Write an enzyme that holds these catalytic residues in place. Structure first.
Site, PDB file in Angstrom:
ATOM      1  N   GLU A  32      35.713  18.510 -44.557  1.00 55.58           N
ATOM      2  CA  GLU A  32      34.654  19.505 -44.648  1.00 55.58           C
ATOM      3  C   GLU A  32      35.207  20.877 -44.261  1.00 55.58           C
ATOM      4  O   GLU A  32      35.803  21.038 -43.185  1.00 55.58           O
ATOM      5  CB  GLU A  32      33.476  19.096 -43.758  1.00 55.58           C
ATOM      6  CG  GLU A  32      32.409  20.137 -43.523  1.00 55.58           C
ATOM      7  CD  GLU A  32      31.757  20.653 -44.793  1.00 55.58           C
ATOM      8  OE1 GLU A  32      31.231  19.830 -45.579  1.00 55.58           O
ATOM      9  OE2 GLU A  32      31.746  21.898 -44.984  1.00 55.58           O
ATOM     10  N   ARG A 108      16.876  18.467 -42.871  1.00 54.37           N
ATOM     11  CA  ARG A 108      18.234  18.331 -43.389  1.00 54.37           C
ATOM     12  C   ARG A 108      19.241  18.235 -42.254  1.00 54.37           C
ATOM     13  O   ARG A 108      20.048  17.299 -42.204  1.00 54.37           O
ATOM     14  CB  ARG A 108      18.577  19.503 -44.314  1.00 54.37           C
ATOM     15  CG  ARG A 108      17.572  19.734 -45.446  1.00 54.37           C
ATOM     16  CD  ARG A 108      18.041  20.821 -46.412  1.00 54.37           C
ATOM     17  NE  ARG A 108      19.280  20.431 -47.080  1.00 54.37           N
ATOM     18  CZ  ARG A 108      19.389  20.159 -48.378  1.00 54.37           C
ATOM     19  NH1 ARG A 108      18.329  20.253 -49.174  1.00 54.37           N
ATOM     20  NH2 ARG A 108      20.566  19.808 -48.880  1.00 54.37           N
ATOM     21  N   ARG A 190      11.205  32.461 -49.763  1.00 54.96           N
ATOM     22  CA  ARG A 190      10.892  31.331 -48.887  1.00 54.96           C
ATOM     23  C   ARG A 190      10.471  31.837 -47.517  1.00 54.96           C
ATOM     24  O   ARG A 190      11.040  32.798 -47.001  1.00 54.96           O
ATOM     25  CB  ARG A 190      12.091  30.390 -48.726  1.00 54.96           C
ATOM     26  CG  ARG A 190      12.816  30.104 -50.028  1.00 54.96           C
ATOM     27  CD  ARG A 190      13.989  29.171 -49.837  1.00 54.96           C
ATOM     28  NE  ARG A 190      13.573  27.884 -49.293  1.00 54.96           N
ATOM     29  CZ  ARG A 190      14.401  26.866 -49.079  1.00 54.96           C
ATOM     30  NH1 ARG A 190      15.689  26.997 -49.379  1.00 54.96           N
ATOM     31  NH2 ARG A 190      13.946  25.724 -48.564  1.00 54.96           N
ATOM     32  N   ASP A 306      26.176  17.437 -56.105  1.00 55.19           N
ATOM     33  CA  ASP A 306      26.101  18.760 -56.729  1.00 55.19           C
ATOM     34  C   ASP A 306      27.420  19.155 -57.375  1.00 55.19           C
ATOM     35  O   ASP A 306      27.420  19.885 -58.365  1.00 55.19           O
ATOM     36  CB  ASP A 306      25.684  19.821 -55.711  1.00 55.19           C
ATOM     37  CG  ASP A 306      24.179  19.832 -55.457  1.00 55.19           C
ATOM     38  OD1 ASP A 306      23.469  18.893 -55.910  1.00 55.19           O
ATOM     39  OD2 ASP A 306      23.696  20.783 -54.799  1.00 55.19           O
ATOM     40  N   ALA A 319      19.230  15.581 -54.720  1.00 58.26           N
ATOM     41  CA  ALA A 319      20.050  14.739 -53.857  1.00 58.26           C
ATOM     42  C   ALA A 319      19.806  13.256 -54.128  1.00 58.26           C
ATOM     43  O   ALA A 319      20.723  12.438 -53.979  1.00 58.26           O
ATOM     44  CB  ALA A 319      19.801  15.070 -52.387  1.00 58.26           C
TER      45      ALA A 319
END
Ligand SMILES: Cc1cc2nc3c(=O)[nH]c(=O)nc-3n(C[C@H](O)[C@H](O)[C@H](O)COP(=O)(O)OP(=O)(O)OC[C@H]3O[C@@H](n4cnc5c(N)ncnc54)[C@H](O)[C@@H]3O)c2cc1C
Ligand SMILES: Cc1cc2nc3c(=O)[nH]c(=O)nc-3n(C[C@H](O)[C@H](O)[C@H](O)COP(=O)(O)OP(=O)(O)OC[C@H]3O[C@@H](n4cnc5c(N)ncnc54)[C@H](O)[C@@H]3O)c2cc1C
Ligand SMILES: [Cl-]
Ligand SMILES: [Cl-]
Lengths: 431, 431
Positions: A32, A108, A190, A306, A319
């Site tokens: 990552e 999340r 948002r 993705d 997802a």
């Protein structure tokens, strides 16, 4: 000796993939780029079909998920509702019954957190941004080179590195448009309001439930969050201009900017924007729609999530598609593991290549359909004809297709997919 | 508010059931009367269907199985074979393809050990012999009384304690014949021979595969073991006498006592018996056929595996039936878990009994069918007609019944079972 998999990308898909693979005895490393930060504080939701896929990957995944939401006299069915957002009548247009726990929602960041604890120690390596892939013969390991100068050597490589995947660029070439996402010419505001504010503007029934407000060239979604104390607002609008290349995809914006796009809409809906904070966020919507991958796999390299097929989020299921990828990839590599275990290194690497070929054969059509489908339902949510009261029958005709497309997502036959993937793997091995 | 289950019995089923329960966040204790492992060195095999059920309980179960068992070319397929054992022709009578990995075989004790290393520490408590069950009110915990004088309290109890289950006794009353297994009036001689001896008596073909030799009132099965260096012999004979219980169900026997039951049979089979050690074992075969359970569950108490439906072993799948039980109970208790989060203690306990009630509804017909079918196929193996050259035409017709009864075991639709179980559970809850 065992089989090692290097997953580039420690997002939800890459971490779910890792859980599935390690629980079967496959040697896994997750690389990552980010320091070790969780995701955004936003919520996300999974179909019951994806949750069952999670279970089959590792039942601890579903435990992580359910310990990462909130606590809900008979049991609540989940409903999608669409409302007319342009005329003050704001009549209810259409409803889809998803059944008991048809959707299961989480935070999340909290879910990705619980998932990494489920994994054994030493799977996830952070500050490992991939920059080159060095392939050799099939019979040899693949070498991943990272930005900090280090290297890693794995039997095979999965790209779980998201909408701007590096594994993708390696497959198709840095200057090919197939290596990159592109703009969908829509972006979202948002932000949150309070439930009393939401109640005050929309009424209690609308305020306490998920509702999509359709209208011309824009639409708005809202649903309660934080145990029905807050409401999340997501307001999508049309943008004729290009998005400046290296301009960031997320940015600051004002509630007055959002209010202007909705000035002609009905009072309650404008009030909802009026109750947002003075500062909110602006999210550009990119996807893989204009330049979908010609193949998800080649040799011993495979794309998932993705990275393979990023979509705009108007099905709220992107997802879920990735979790199907993970389940498919996991079942295939497990089959490589058991069926070649006592064989030469030539057979074992051939089998990886045969498995990744099978993955591409069974996954690409559904995933690339889904990317297209996500843009299509947005177009239906934003018909110009929502503005014209004389064109109401045509505008409302859209919901049958929305129904068909939702049911194709929610009723995915993942057992048949796995069966097909195994058959294609055996056929690919000359069996 | 966590849900605790007490599993009585640390055999294959109780542990598999514990693995599936703990992977889903349910608090489990297994109480096992012995202090170590048993059935040291015995082999068993699971259907591919049962292996898929294991995988849905916890994929680590499947990894455990595969590290507890067994050159290029292609992939081997698995065949049941039947051979005429009476007449000197000794010709192949029938065969049945189960496909690639149609069965997966392991060493029992080594498998159970690997399973225990999969569970977290402290789940299994040895030297805990269930003596008595104290049921109070549905909203109170069930108290378990052990022979060492300690007590345990759990929300619910699962009897996984085998053919002579203490839990079954408690349910039906220790004086009921339903609480006890009974003699099938057959017993078996078991012992090994060398592979070299096996070849010179049956030929290379038969010695290296699993075969069942049929005949009048007896039959014999053999298959290779320990890297195809030896062959396991199980010769089943008829017994008109009662097994005067308190007579141990195992006991020593002589090679010649075995040989005497097969004096009229063809020479190859007699040569096999002669190649055994002078001393070998006698195994009485009991089951639950004569007094089958009126119910597998009642209140907050449920029976699984042999405790619920011990069978004579002539399908070689008795545990596979138990793994289905464990899958079905695990999915139900997890559904109890998520569906009653936040509810009152009263509702949680009602949910438990509703789930156990649903388990009984969906399992008792197939499980008790399989007990009957085990005796049935054994009868077909031991038809007196096998010896009569006038009735061998109708004797050979049993094989279609063998095929159908096997396929009904091997092609179990466990997903339908899971679906029907959840639906019945919801029905039992008033929705
Ligand atoms: C507003 C919005 C709402 C959504 N709501 C839902 C929903 O409700 N339900 C649903 O199913 N889907 C939803 N989606 C879609 C879903 O979020 C995505 O499909 C999902 O996040 C994809 O997961 P991923 O692991 O493939 O990619 P990512 O989440 O993007 O993870 C990719 C990871 O790889 C790392 N990475 C990138 N490059 C490198 C590199 N060179 N080297 C190493 N690491 C790298 C990244 O830092 C990142 O952590 C939504 C999307 C949006 C925009
Ligand atoms: C010769 C033979 C061969 C077989 N081969 C196969 C095969 O190849 N494949 C297949 O699927 N099936 C096979 N079976 C069937 C299978 O072995 C059984 O169905 C299986 O063992 C049932 O497992 P269980 O855990 O329910 O019971 P058990 O294995 O009998 O274990 C029950 C556990 O409960 C413990 N216990 C008992 N009473 C108490 C008490 N009061 N308190 C605490 N603990 C207690 C016992 O110590 C034991 O550990 C075979 C059976 C036989 C007889
Ligand atoms: Cl999405
Ligand atoms: Cl059996």
């Amino acid at each position: 000796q065992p089989l090692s998999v290097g997953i580039v990308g420690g997002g939800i898909i890459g971490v779910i993939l890792a859980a599935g693979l390690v629980r079967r005895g496959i040697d896994v490393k997750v690389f990552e780029q980010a320091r070790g930060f969780r995701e955004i504080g936003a919520g996300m939701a999974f179909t019951a079909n994806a949750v069952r896929c999670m279970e089959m990957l590792d039942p601890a995944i579903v435990w992580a998920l359910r310990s990462s939401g909130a606590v809900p006299q008979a049991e609540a069915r989940d409903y999608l509702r669409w409302v007319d957002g342009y005329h003050e009548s704001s009549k209810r247009l259409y409803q889809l019954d998803a059944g008991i726990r048809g959707f299961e929602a989480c935070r999340r960041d909290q879910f990705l957190e619980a998932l990494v604890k489920v994994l054994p120690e030493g799977i996830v390596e952070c500050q490992k941004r991939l920059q080159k892939i060095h392939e050799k013969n099939e019979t040899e390991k693949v070498t991943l080179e990272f930005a900090d100068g280090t290297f890693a050597h794995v039997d095979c490589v999965i790209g779980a590195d998201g909408i701007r995947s590096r594994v993708r660029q390696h497959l198709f070439g840095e200057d090919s448009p197939y290596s990159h996402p592109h703009y969908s010419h829509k972006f979202a505001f948002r932000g949150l309001i309070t439930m009393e504010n939401a109640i005050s503007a929309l009424g209690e029934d609308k305020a306490r439930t998920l509702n999509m407000h359709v209208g011309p060239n824009a639409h708005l979604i809202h649903f309660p969050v934080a145990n029905e104390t807050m409401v999340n607002i997501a307001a999508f609008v049309s943008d004729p201009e290009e998005w400046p290349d290296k301009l960031s995809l997320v940015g600051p914006a004002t509630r007055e900017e959002a209010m202007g796009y909705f000035a002609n809409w009905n009072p309650g809906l404008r009030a909802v924007l009026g109750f947002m904070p003075e500062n909110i966020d602006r999210w550009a919507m990119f996807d893989t729609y204009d330049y979908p991958a010609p193949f998800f796999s080649r040799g011993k390299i495979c794309l998932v999530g993705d990275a393979a097929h990023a979509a705009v989020p108007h099905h709220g299921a992107g997802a879920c598609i990735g979790i199907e990828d993970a389940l498919c990839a996991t079942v295939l590599l497990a089959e490589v593991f058991v069926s070649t275990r006592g064989k030469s290194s030539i057979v074992r690497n051939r089998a990886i290549a045969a498995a990744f070929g099978s993955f591409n054969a069974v996954r690409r059509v559904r995933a690339q359909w889904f990317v297209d489908s996500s843009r299509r339902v947005c177009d239906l949510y934003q018909q110009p004809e929502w503005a014209d009261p004389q064109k109401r029958i045509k505008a409302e005709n859209c919901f049958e297709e929305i129904k068909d497309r939702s049911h194709k997502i929610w009723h995915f036959d993942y057992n048949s997919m796995l069966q097909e993937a195994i058959e294609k793997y055996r056929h690919n091995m000359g069996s």
